[PDB]
Amino acid sequence: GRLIYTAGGYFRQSLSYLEAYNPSNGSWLRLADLQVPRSGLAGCVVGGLLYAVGGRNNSPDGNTDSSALDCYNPMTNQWSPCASMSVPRNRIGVGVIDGHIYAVGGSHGCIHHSSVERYEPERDEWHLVAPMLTRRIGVGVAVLNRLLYAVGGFDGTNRLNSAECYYPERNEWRMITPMNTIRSGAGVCVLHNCIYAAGGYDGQDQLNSVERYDVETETWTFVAPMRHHRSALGITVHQGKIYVLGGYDGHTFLDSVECYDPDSDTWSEVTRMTSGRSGVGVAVTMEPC
Ligand SMILES: COc1cc([C@@H](CC(=O)O)c2ccc(C)c(CN(C)S(=O)(=O)c3ccccc3)c2)cc2nnn(C)c12
Ligand SMILES: [Cl-]
């Protein structure tokens, strides 16, 4: 089976948890803690390693933004440090193209990054690429058809409905059609030919709305809203279904996990995380050991 891994997050302070959910049987496993607690990080998978990227350690003893890339091997249930990024990136978004990891945006203190860098596992090296046209933290990132999309976020002044696309062979960013909704800290992922943006914060409210961008039509369309309003949710795709994990609804750090069936256009509660949290990193890979 493949599992949905949730790494880090926030409740009262930044968390070190790594836990893995099995959609086939409803079970959660607690696995090895992150070496450093972090919220506002991103997860991704390349070649059966799980990567935790960026974030911030919000702790009683200080707040430290992370430039870390940490490598988890499910076969050994151990974390190893991999090469650090050029800069700390809190409230980061990540995407994988052709075995390479793109780290997009995020903050370092009051610095809101437009910069983007790319990691090569074979060399354990990061290299900067062209920066986005817009500074974005709490940025949603997805990959469709080997193109990288940066969606919404916060530019240091305004939360954003704008989005843009990176063309690797041109090393160039271009704006796409903006969303219908301003969203910072949305969950962004890809399913079929569409980029989904679920939830987020608009500077006033946490959102339950969900909309999707069809690369062929260049339009955003709303689908059914989630059962819960959520900002700083985790999101992933497992077998043609979107799963959203946790986040903040204006009142509670949610343990709710919901999944979306695109054929019925419905959201269903699927499970609860072992404890409520937001700002997690999420990805899917093989079950450990
Ligand atoms: C300033 O108020 C908020 C800003 C954000 C945005 C940033 C912005 O638009 O300014 C944002 C986006 C992405 C992440 C991962 C986070 C951090 N996370 C919530 S977190 O879970 O990592 C976290 C939790 C509490 C304290 C620190 C960390 C924030 C979302 C909010 N939703 N409600 N409000 C009241 C929000
Ligand atoms: Cl933060």
Tab-separated table of C-alpha atoms and ligand atoms in Angstrom:
chain	number	residue	atom	x	y	z
A	1	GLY	CA	0.000	0.000	0.000
A	2	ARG	CA	0.887	3.671	-0.317
A	3	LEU	CA	0.471	5.968	2.693
A	4	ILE	CA	-0.226	9.638	3.221
A	5	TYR	CA	2.569	11.113	5.391
A	6	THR	CA	1.946	14.253	7.483
A	7	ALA	CA	5.079	15.956	8.790
A	8	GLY	CA	5.358	18.732	11.363
A	9	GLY	CA	2.691	21.369	11.817
A	10	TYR	CA	1.492	23.673	14.580
A	11	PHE	CA	-0.568	23.403	17.751
A	12	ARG	CA	0.507	25.768	20.614
A	13	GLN	CA	3.981	25.501	19.069
A	14	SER	CA	5.711	23.969	16.021
A	15	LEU	CA	5.533	20.134	15.989
A	16	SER	CA	8.024	17.350	15.138
A	17	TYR	CA	5.413	14.660	14.352
A	18	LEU	CA	5.656	12.284	11.425
A	19	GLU	CA	2.613	10.085	11.011
A	20	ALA	CA	1.383	7.967	8.125
A	21	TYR	CA	-2.235	7.251	7.222
A	22	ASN	CA	-3.364	4.165	5.303
A	23	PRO	CA	-6.537	4.850	3.307
A	24	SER	CA	-6.892	1.071	2.722
A	25	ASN	CA	-7.578	0.300	6.434
A	26	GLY	CA	-8.046	3.684	8.277
A	27	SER	CA	-4.852	3.182	10.396
A	28	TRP	CA	-2.322	5.796	11.532
A	29	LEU	CA	1.342	4.949	12.340
A	30	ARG	CA	3.575	7.288	14.357
A	31	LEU	CA	7.061	7.227	12.843
A	32	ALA	CA	10.376	8.956	13.668
A	33	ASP	CA	10.090	12.638	14.745
A	34	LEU	CA	11.636	15.393	12.663
A	35	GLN	CA	15.028	16.344	14.156
A	36	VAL	CA	13.724	19.967	14.384
A	37	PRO	CA	10.050	20.957	14.959
A	38	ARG	CA	8.591	23.036	12.151
A	39	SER	CA	5.336	24.460	10.904
A	40	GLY	CA	4.774	26.106	7.529
A	41	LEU	CA	6.885	23.462	5.793
A	42	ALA	CA	6.164	21.404	2.696
A	43	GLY	CA	6.502	17.703	1.991
A	44	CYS	CA	7.233	15.922	-1.252
A	45	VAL	CA	8.489	12.575	-2.504
A	46	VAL	CA	11.211	11.766	-5.024
A	47	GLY	CA	12.363	8.204	-5.684
A	48	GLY	CA	10.860	6.696	-2.511
A	49	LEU	CA	12.446	9.286	-0.179
A	50	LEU	CA	10.228	11.720	1.694
A	51	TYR	CA	11.518	15.245	1.926
A	52	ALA	CA	10.610	17.928	4.470
A	53	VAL	CA	11.373	21.397	3.140
A	54	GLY	CA	11.539	24.763	4.871
A	55	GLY	CA	9.151	25.990	7.596
A	56	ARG	CA	9.741	27.729	10.921
A	57	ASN	CA	10.344	26.439	14.406
A	58	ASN	CA	7.854	28.450	16.532
A	59	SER	CA	9.030	27.457	20.012
A	60	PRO	CA	8.887	28.891	23.575
A	61	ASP	CA	12.674	29.400	23.241
A	62	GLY	CA	12.553	31.372	19.918
A	63	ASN	CA	11.259	31.501	16.346
A	64	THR	CA	13.678	30.251	13.665
A	65	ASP	CA	12.860	30.089	9.962
A	66	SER	CA	14.199	26.943	8.292
A	67	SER	CA	16.354	26.583	5.196
A	68	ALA	CA	16.471	22.836	5.930
A	69	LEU	CA	15.892	19.958	3.565
A	70	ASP	CA	15.563	16.728	5.489
A	71	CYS	CA	15.484	13.279	3.941
A	72	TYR	CA	13.330	10.471	5.382
A	73	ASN	CA	13.876	6.900	4.184
A	74	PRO	CA	10.763	4.795	4.901
A	75	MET	CA	12.782	1.608	4.685
A	76	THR	CA	14.903	2.560	7.746
A	77	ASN	CA	12.509	4.963	9.493
A	78	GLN	CA	15.366	7.497	9.854
A	79	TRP	CA	15.712	11.189	8.999
A	80	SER	CA	19.022	12.472	7.546
A	81	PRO	CA	19.944	16.052	6.771
A	82	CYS	CA	20.210	16.798	3.046
A	83	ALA	CA	21.627	20.018	1.573
A	84	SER	CA	20.161	23.273	2.951
A	85	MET	CA	18.536	25.830	0.641
A	86	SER	CA	20.051	29.236	-0.170
A	87	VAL	CA	17.690	30.972	2.281
A	88	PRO	CA	15.148	30.238	5.025
A	89	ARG	CA	11.669	29.734	3.585
A	90	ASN	CA	8.752	29.699	6.020
A	91	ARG	CA	5.225	29.100	4.586
A	92	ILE	CA	6.882	27.574	1.540
A	93	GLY	CA	5.414	25.731	-1.439
A	94	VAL	CA	7.168	22.872	-3.250
A	95	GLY	CA	6.750	20.947	-6.516
A	96	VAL	CA	8.614	18.065	-8.088
A	97	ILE	CA	9.472	17.940	-11.829
A	98	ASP	CA	11.582	15.234	-13.440
A	99	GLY	CA	13.090	14.087	-10.119
A	100	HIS	CA	13.993	17.653	-9.041
A	101	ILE	CA	12.442	19.631	-6.185
A	102	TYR	CA	11.410	23.250	-6.633
A	103	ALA	CA	11.260	25.365	-3.472
A	104	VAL	CA	9.044	28.385	-4.046
A	105	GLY	CA	8.652	31.631	-2.091
A	106	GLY	CA	8.061	31.636	1.678
A	107	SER	CA	9.335	34.153	4.261
A	108	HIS	CA	12.521	34.860	6.193
A	109	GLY	CA	11.492	37.298	8.941
A	110	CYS	CA	9.786	40.245	7.167
A	111	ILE	CA	11.435	39.195	3.836
A	112	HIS	CA	8.711	37.790	1.548
A	113	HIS	CA	10.532	35.793	-1.148
A	114	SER	CA	9.940	35.858	-4.894
A	115	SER	CA	13.028	33.613	-5.252
A	116	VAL	CA	12.834	29.965	-6.352
A	117	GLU	CA	15.474	27.263	-6.183
A	118	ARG	CA	15.799	23.758	-7.508
A	119	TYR	CA	17.246	20.651	-5.776
A	120	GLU	CA	18.978	17.731	-7.554
A	121	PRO	CA	18.977	14.548	-5.408
A	122	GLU	CA	21.754	12.943	-7.537
A	123	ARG	CA	24.135	15.815	-6.569
A	124	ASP	CA	22.557	16.903	-3.188
A	125	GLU	CA	22.746	20.534	-4.418
A	126	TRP	CA	20.353	23.473	-4.700
A	127	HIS	CA	20.585	26.078	-7.514
A	128	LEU	CA	18.531	29.275	-7.832
A	129	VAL	CA	16.344	29.647	-10.911
A	130	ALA	CA	14.325	32.633	-12.178
A	131	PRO	CA	12.295	34.341	-9.453
A	132	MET	CA	8.513	34.611	-9.563
A	133	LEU	CA	6.938	37.830	-10.812
A	134	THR	CA	5.297	38.189	-7.373
A	135	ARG	CA	6.497	37.752	-3.789
A	136	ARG	CA	4.495	34.859	-2.310
A	137	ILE	CA	4.368	33.272	1.112
A	138	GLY	CA	1.646	30.810	2.002
A	139	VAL	CA	1.930	29.983	-1.668
A	140	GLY	CA	0.234	26.939	-3.173
A	141	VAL	CA	2.374	25.002	-5.623
A	142	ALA	CA	1.387	22.237	-8.084
A	143	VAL	CA	2.909	20.502	-11.071
A	144	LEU	CA	0.894	19.597	-14.174
A	145	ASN	CA	2.363	18.462	-17.440
A	146	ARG	CA	5.930	19.251	-16.226
A	147	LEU	CA	5.059	22.893	-15.638
A	148	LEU	CA	5.220	24.483	-12.160
A	149	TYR	CA	2.380	26.649	-10.813
A	150	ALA	CA	2.510	29.123	-7.915
A	151	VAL	CA	-0.941	30.010	-6.687
A	152	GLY	CA	-2.100	32.761	-4.339
A	153	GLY	CA	-0.332	33.546	-1.081
A	154	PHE	CA	0.649	36.816	0.612
A	155	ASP	CA	3.116	39.352	-0.881
A	156	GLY	CA	3.943	41.172	2.387
A	157	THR	CA	1.035	43.616	1.908
A	158	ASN	CA	-1.939	41.863	0.191
A	159	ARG	CA	-3.304	38.318	0.087
A	160	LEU	CA	-3.463	37.242	-3.582
A	161	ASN	CA	-5.877	35.694	-6.113
A	162	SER	CA	-3.073	35.849	-8.728
A	163	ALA	CA	-1.206	32.857	-9.986
A	164	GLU	CA	1.728	32.199	-12.301
A	165	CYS	CA	3.440	29.364	-14.194
A	166	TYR	CA	7.154	28.450	-14.588
A	167	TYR	CA	8.391	27.054	-17.958
A	168	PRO	CA	11.618	25.192	-17.066
A	169	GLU	CA	13.097	25.088	-20.584
A	170	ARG	CA	12.689	28.938	-20.811
A	171	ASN	CA	13.546	29.559	-17.143
A	172	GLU	CA	10.662	32.030	-17.224
A	173	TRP	CA	7.557	32.835	-15.131
A	174	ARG	CA	4.286	34.077	-16.662
A	175	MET	CA	0.993	35.082	-15.065
A	176	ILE	CA	-2.022	32.796	-15.637
A	177	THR	CA	-5.731	33.626	-15.127
A	178	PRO	CA	-6.197	34.718	-11.483
A	179	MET	CA	-8.431	32.676	-9.136
A	180	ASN	CA	-11.950	33.869	-8.417
A	181	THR	CA	-11.000	33.964	-4.698
A	182	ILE	CA	-8.139	35.587	-2.774
A	183	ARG	CA	-6.368	32.689	-1.007
A	184	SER	CA	-3.347	32.600	1.271
A	185	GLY	CA	-2.402	29.237	2.810
A	186	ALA	CA	-4.696	27.291	0.536
A	187	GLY	CA	-4.140	23.640	-0.262
A	188	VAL	CA	-3.056	23.337	-3.901
A	189	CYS	CA	-2.713	20.100	-5.880
A	190	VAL	CA	-3.350	18.510	-9.244
A	191	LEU	CA	-5.952	15.996	-10.287
A	192	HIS	CA	-6.534	14.981	-13.900
A	193	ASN	CA	-6.013	18.082	-16.080
A	194	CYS	CA	-6.834	20.563	-13.309
A	195	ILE	CA	-5.064	22.522	-10.566
A	196	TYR	CA	-7.198	22.620	-7.412
A	197	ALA	CA	-7.039	25.375	-4.829
A	198	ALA	CA	-8.945	24.460	-1.658
A	199	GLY	CA	-9.514	26.697	1.326
A	200	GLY	CA	-7.056	29.346	2.447
A	201	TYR	CA	-7.235	32.731	4.160
A	202	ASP	CA	-8.366	35.972	2.463
A	203	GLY	CA	-7.192	38.357	5.185
A	204	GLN	CA	-10.537	38.117	7.013
A	205	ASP	CA	-11.952	34.581	6.898
A	206	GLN	CA	-10.818	31.015	6.558
A	207	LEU	CA	-12.400	29.521	3.431
A	208	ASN	CA	-14.295	26.290	2.612
A	209	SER	CA	-14.507	27.113	-1.126
A	210	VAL	CA	-12.653	25.066	-3.702
A	211	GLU	CA	-11.883	26.009	-7.308
A	212	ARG	CA	-9.950	24.424	-10.127
A	213	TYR	CA	-7.982	25.633	-13.127
A	214	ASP	CA	-8.217	23.809	-16.400
A	215	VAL	CA	-4.959	24.315	-18.251
A	216	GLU	CA	-6.708	23.831	-21.617
A	217	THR	CA	-9.497	26.425	-21.016
A	218	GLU	CA	-7.496	28.770	-18.734
A	219	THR	CA	-10.555	29.178	-16.516
A	220	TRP	CA	-11.110	28.671	-12.784
A	221	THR	CA	-14.369	26.947	-11.804
A	222	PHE	CA	-15.749	26.361	-8.254
A	223	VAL	CA	-16.557	22.814	-7.281
A	224	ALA	CA	-18.319	21.694	-4.084
A	225	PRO	CA	-16.980	23.396	-0.901
A	226	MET	CA	-15.202	21.391	1.830
A	227	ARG	CA	-17.169	20.417	4.972
A	228	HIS	CA	-14.850	22.695	7.021
A	229	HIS	CA	-13.447	26.163	6.486
A	230	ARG	CA	-9.630	25.726	6.612
A	231	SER	CA	-6.436	27.735	6.174
A	232	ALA	CA	-2.924	26.230	6.301
A	233	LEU	CA	-4.262	22.788	5.380
A	234	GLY	CA	-2.191	19.930	4.098
A	235	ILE	CA	-3.302	18.453	0.787
A	236	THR	CA	-2.380	15.477	-1.372
A	237	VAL	CA	-3.766	13.164	-4.029
A	238	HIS	CA	-4.048	9.439	-3.401
A	239	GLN	CA	-5.701	7.241	-6.119
A	240	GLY	CA	-7.670	9.973	-7.966
A	241	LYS	CA	-8.990	11.544	-4.761
A	242	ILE	CA	-7.869	14.724	-3.053
A	243	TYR	CA	-7.304	14.518	0.699
A	244	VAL	CA	-7.139	17.581	2.924
A	245	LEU	CA	-5.608	17.357	6.376
A	246	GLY	CA	-6.050	19.696	9.283
A	247	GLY	CA	-5.701	23.451	9.203
A	248	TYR	CA	-7.269	26.370	11.077
A	249	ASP	CA	-10.991	27.277	10.924
A	250	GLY	CA	-10.924	30.520	12.966
A	251	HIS	CA	-11.660	28.561	16.222
A	252	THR	CA	-10.015	25.124	16.291
A	253	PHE	CA	-6.824	23.554	14.909
A	254	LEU	CA	-8.687	20.768	13.048
A	255	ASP	CA	-8.033	17.063	13.270
A	256	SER	CA	-10.527	16.596	10.411
A	257	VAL	CA	-9.372	14.801	7.256
A	258	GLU	CA	-11.758	15.126	4.263
A	259	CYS	CA	-11.596	13.648	0.771
A	260	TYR	CA	-13.024	14.832	-2.507
A	261	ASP	CA	-14.571	12.539	-5.099
A	262	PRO	CA	-14.504	14.436	-8.404
A	263	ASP	CA	-17.010	12.027	-10.069
A	264	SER	CA	-19.768	12.864	-7.497
A	265	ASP	CA	-18.423	16.358	-6.667
A	266	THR	CA	-18.675	15.598	-2.950
A	267	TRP	CA	-16.454	15.923	0.103
A	268	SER	CA	-16.578	13.226	2.775
A	269	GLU	CA	-14.961	12.945	6.234
A	270	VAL	CA	-12.456	10.099	6.023
A	271	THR	CA	-10.523	9.982	9.333
A	272	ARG	CA	-9.153	12.195	12.081
A	273	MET	CA	-5.531	12.945	12.631
A	274	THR	CA	-4.340	11.795	16.034
A	275	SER	CA	-4.369	15.441	17.154
A	276	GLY	CA	-5.548	18.766	15.701
A	277	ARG	CA	-2.892	20.807	13.859
A	278	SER	CA	-2.252	23.242	10.964
A	279	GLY	CA	0.688	24.178	8.682
A	280	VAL	CA	1.669	20.554	8.068
A	281	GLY	CA	3.635	19.136	5.162
A	282	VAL	CA	2.049	16.184	3.320
A	283	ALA	CA	3.131	13.625	0.733
A	284	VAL	CA	2.465	10.062	-0.477
A	285	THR	CA	4.934	7.164	-0.748
A	286	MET	CA	5.412	3.418	0.088
A	287	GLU	CA	4.650	2.126	3.576
A	288	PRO	CA	7.769	1.950	5.772
A	289	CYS	CA	9.913	-1.166	6.496
B	1	LIG	C1	-2.174	36.640	9.847
B	1	LIG	O1	-3.128	35.593	10.025
B	1	LIG	C2	-3.130	34.558	9.130
B	1	LIG	C3	-2.188	34.357	8.120
B	1	LIG	C4	-2.280	33.265	7.257
B	1	LIG	C5	-1.278	33.005	6.138
B	1	LIG	C6	-0.299	34.145	5.904
B	1	LIG	C7	-0.967	35.458	5.517
B	1	LIG	O2	-1.873	35.481	4.647
B	1	LIG	O3	-0.552	36.463	6.117
B	1	LIG	C8	-0.581	31.664	6.334
B	1	LIG	C9	-0.395	30.831	5.239
B	1	LIG	C10	0.233	29.607	5.380
B	1	LIG	C11	0.693	29.183	6.620
B	1	LIG	C12	1.371	27.840	6.718
B	1	LIG	C13	0.516	30.010	7.737
B	1	LIG	C14	1.004	29.577	9.102
B	1	LIG	N1	0.094	28.603	9.721
B	1	LIG	C15	-1.262	29.104	9.969
B	1	LIG	S1	0.690	27.552	10.802
B	1	LIG	O4	-0.316	26.573	11.062
B	1	LIG	O5	1.986	27.156	10.339
B	1	LIG	C16	0.866	28.570	12.232
B	1	LIG	C17	-0.190	28.700	13.119
B	1	LIG	C18	-0.058	29.495	14.237
B	1	LIG	C19	1.134	30.165	14.471
B	1	LIG	C20	2.190	30.036	13.583
B	1	LIG	C21	2.054	29.238	12.462
B	1	LIG	C22	-0.120	31.238	7.574
B	1	LIG	C23	-3.340	32.376	7.429
B	1	LIG	C24	-4.292	32.581	8.452
B	1	LIG	N2	-5.390	31.851	8.795
B	1	LIG	N3	-5.977	32.435	9.823
B	1	LIG	N4	-5.245	33.538	10.129
B	1	LIG	C25	-5.652	34.396	11.233
B	1	LIG	C26	-4.186	33.642	9.277
B	2	CL	CL	4.581	31.319	10.970
